[PDB]
Amino acid sequence: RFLKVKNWETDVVLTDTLHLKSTLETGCTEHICMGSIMLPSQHTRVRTKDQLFPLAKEFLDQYYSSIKRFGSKAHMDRLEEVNKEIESTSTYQLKDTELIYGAKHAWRNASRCVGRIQWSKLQVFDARDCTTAHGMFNYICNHVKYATNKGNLRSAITIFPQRTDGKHDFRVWNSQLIRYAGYKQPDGSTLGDPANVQFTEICIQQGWKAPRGRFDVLPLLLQANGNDPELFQIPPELVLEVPIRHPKFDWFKDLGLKWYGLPAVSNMLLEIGGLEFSACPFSGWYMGTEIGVRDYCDNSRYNILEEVAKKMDLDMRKTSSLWKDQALVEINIAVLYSFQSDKVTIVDHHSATESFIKHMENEYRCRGGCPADWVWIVPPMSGSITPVFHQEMLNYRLTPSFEYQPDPWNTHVWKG
Amino acid sequence: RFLKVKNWETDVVLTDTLHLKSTLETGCTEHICMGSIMLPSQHTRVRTKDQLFPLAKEFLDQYYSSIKRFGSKAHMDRLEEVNKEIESTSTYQLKDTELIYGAKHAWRNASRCVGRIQWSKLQVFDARDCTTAHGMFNYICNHVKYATNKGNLRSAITIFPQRTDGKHDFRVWNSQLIRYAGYKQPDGSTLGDPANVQFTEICIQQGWKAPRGRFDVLPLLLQANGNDPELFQIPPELVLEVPIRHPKFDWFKDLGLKWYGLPAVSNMLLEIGGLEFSACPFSGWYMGTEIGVRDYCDNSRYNILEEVAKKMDLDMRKTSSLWKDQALVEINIAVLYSFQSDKVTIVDHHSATESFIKHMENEYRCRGGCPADWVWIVPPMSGSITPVFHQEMLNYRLTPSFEYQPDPWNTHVW
Ligand code: HEM
Ligand code: HEM
Ligand SMILES: Cc1cc(N)nc(CCc2cc(CC[C@H]3CCCN3C)cc(F)c2F)c1
Ligand SMILES: Cc1cc(N)nc(CCc2cc(CC[C@H]3CCCN3C)cc(F)c2F)c1
Ligand SMILES: C[C@H](O)[C@H](O)[C@H]1CNc2nc(N)[nH]c(=O)c2N1
Ligand SMILES: C[C@H](O)[C@H](O)[C@H]1CNc2nc(N)[nH]c(=O)c2N1
Ligand SMILES: [Zn+2]
């Protein structure tokens, strides 16, 4: 059965056959669409030998198809070798090749990621020999340094050992490798990034000495082999930051804003052939609106719209002056200007959405489809003047995949 | 099965039980979300005697529930009376009360409509006695004049006779009562409104004399009882228009832009209790972005962005200057400024989306939920600085409903 999607701006129609290879569930039914549910139970992540070999077999079938070896003796022996290793040890180990393929395809399958044109150029760092939080710190430092590359960012992922009985997990307790602290003041106001208050408090409790600034880079909190997590300061010379200035407004620098250059998601779960990699930091480079629109302007984040609008001297009385929209654009121009001026890799939302359309069309032709979450692909500003707004998209889940998982501080059994 | 929706800007969580009353289908499955498909086969639309009575019962049941007379004599009496009429006539007729309720609730159930906080204040015009396109024209002029109200816009719907055997359909061939013409130029491009080029052809191609200007109000093309449709020009004094100027850029007025005040959708099908009202033009008032973002700036529409950015002397060399975004805001500032200045009702996207959150709150409290289509509720600019962006919404199809229907010219046994 075939399915068509139409671009209502260009009338291009594309036929999805890839959705037939969909295993996991969306969250929707014939009678309810959960398309805007943020983290439905299906996107979040204790797995026995019973269901594991089918998951292994399908991954390996995919893998050997991509390398044009489906049904080869190499393919059959690997299936055999995996089968016996599962029944003998209740799990199995991916070869290096399989790990690299898995990690790339997980990104390729990330239906919410507008950045996927880049999916084949992923630097995969195998940290499966890691055993301690200190060893995790070292792997993450090398990741950050390689990825940052003095501003010329390179996509990378570092893969720590897979889950076994779920009692010995490797977890990075930070949502992202580099994030600013947030402090709840007694007067109710927040200093720093309000999204990080809960995490900041954990770090402080774990012994972090907080400078209590507006842009304190948080320490790494690292759990190895299911042990209690341990604090580590990322070396400051490894955290590349960009002071934010505006190309026409000289008063903008005096807002004291900066942001880090390396977006690196560290709290997601990488699933490859039934194996669960609970610690798999990955990184790329920023789309400008992630900082300019969400980080700075969300009411529940730094929320500088008011101050920026005040300094532009906009009509802030009625909303219908669109003072909020006017300031948002200027803040986002500044983010882009500052990164480009400092030669830190960044993409504006127009370029990124156009690229994703090309990627998506290419994927329908070479792959039979491209799963895409419209709710997430459309940028959080100027949506309809980017070409993804007008693009019908089919959302379905392929594996390998990145899944959410509960924050470890809610599931961890503390040792002491 | 008793579902929760979370707002991520406020942590407010609502429990939806209304979705359990859902009847029609979404187009999604457990394996695939079609939440971004414009027109799945369900949202588009003869009824047999067996299908019609359950549809009527369900509608009448909710109707008599809403008037606190469920399980009453009048309820059972009406139930049997409609039951008798179906068995006899293979259809039935709504009492005016049920018609008004049906219309208001088709709006209330429109999961893609952000303006539904107003749903109960709908002015329903019963046009079921209409028999001719001239008659249809008269009802539509009365609708337009009532709805416009000298710029103090009022919601209205006018309901023409229901479908019978699909051979006697009433249809308004226009997609909106008021739309600008679109003509393809000999030199390649498109003059006026490119969305309307085929229809603008069918008008000329059926007798219209086109001014071939850039903002020509299209004529009405009215089809009664399945006959060939007829051309009628809306009296210009009924078409309230706003010249678009900017409160900072005096050159803005020289762009020659204007828009009409009355958004009046005329091509949808209104379904009440299994009955199909194929001609049911309805109208309210604009959210600013509908004109400024979509009408003026879509590349498949008036696409004035490049011209406006030029006049602002923005750096259009690279997309990273965000000149498109900068101009988009200015254009939308101007639309709001103009409508407000001329005292024509308009809501900005910040005001309308806040209203819709309040409406959601109201519906979850007093009804148990509110079906909503995030892909359509989120404005086409500044999405995340509006509250609806961070609002989880459940989308499901309730009836009475507005549905899409095939364009008449594809269908009309000419
Ligand atoms: C290289 C440049 C990249 C850009 C510009 C980019 C952009 C984005 C953006 C804007 C989002 C929306 C999420 C949000 O707004 O919070 C997203 C989501 C996502 N990205 Fe990418 N990304 C990039 C690289 C990567 C890489 C290297 C990976 C993994 C290997 C990745 C995996 C994902 C995933 C899994 C999501 C889903 C988030 C979720 O489900 O919550 N991205 N990306
Ligand atoms: C009173 C002010 C109103 C406002 C501000 C408003 C706003 C909107 C907007 C912005 C959309 C998105 C569609 C698009 O972008 O083209 C929409 C859709 C819709 N509106 Fe409302 N609307 C209003 C009144 C009404 C009324 C009076 C009705 C009928 C009684 C109605 C029924 C609908 C329906 C059915 C849709 C979606 C059509 C579909 O399913 O694709 N609206 N509205
Ligand atoms: C590699 C990379 C490049 C890039 N340009 N941007 C990113 C960040 C995108 C992103 C964001 C989130 C959580 C945000 C959600 C979770 C709950 C609250 N927030 C709304 C998870 C992800 F996996 C992810 F990729 C990553
Ligand atoms: C009464 C009213 C008030 C108001 N502020 N705006 C409107 C117009 C919005 C609208 C648009 C459409 C279809 C347009 C679709 C079809 C394919 C291309 N377009 C995406 C149907 C509707 F029912 C509708 F209301 C009406
Ligand atoms: C493909 C996609 O469904 C299409 O562009 C939709 C997206 N959301 C929309 N939302 C509104 N309000 N109006 C629209 O026309 C659209 N178009
Ligand atoms: C409720 C809604 O799903 C939620 O706010 C989503 C919507 N789309 C998004 N899209 C992106 N890129 N990032 C986000 O955080 C969100 N949040
Ligand atoms: Zn869905």
Short mmCIF file of C-alpha atoms in Angstrom, two decimals, chain A residues 15-19 362-370 396:
data_model
loop_
_atom_site.label_atom_id
_atom_site.label_comp_id
_atom_site.label_asym_id
_atom_site.label_seq_id
_atom_site.Cartn_x
_atom_site.Cartn_y
_atom_site.Cartn_z
CA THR A 15 4.89 8.48 -2.60
CA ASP A 16 5.77 6.91 0.74
CA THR A 17 6.33 3.18 0.74
CA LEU A 18 8.84 3.33 3.61
CA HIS A 19 6.06 3.62 6.22
CA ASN A 362 15.89 12.80 -1.85
CA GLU A 363 14.83 10.32 0.84
CA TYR A 364 11.51 9.54 -0.89
CA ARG A 365 13.44 8.75 -4.07
CA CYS A 366 16.30 6.65 -2.67
CA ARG A 367 14.47 5.24 0.36
CA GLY A 368 10.73 5.32 -0.34
CA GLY A 369 9.94 7.84 2.37
CA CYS A 370 11.11 10.18 5.08
CA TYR A 396 5.96 7.04 11.80
#
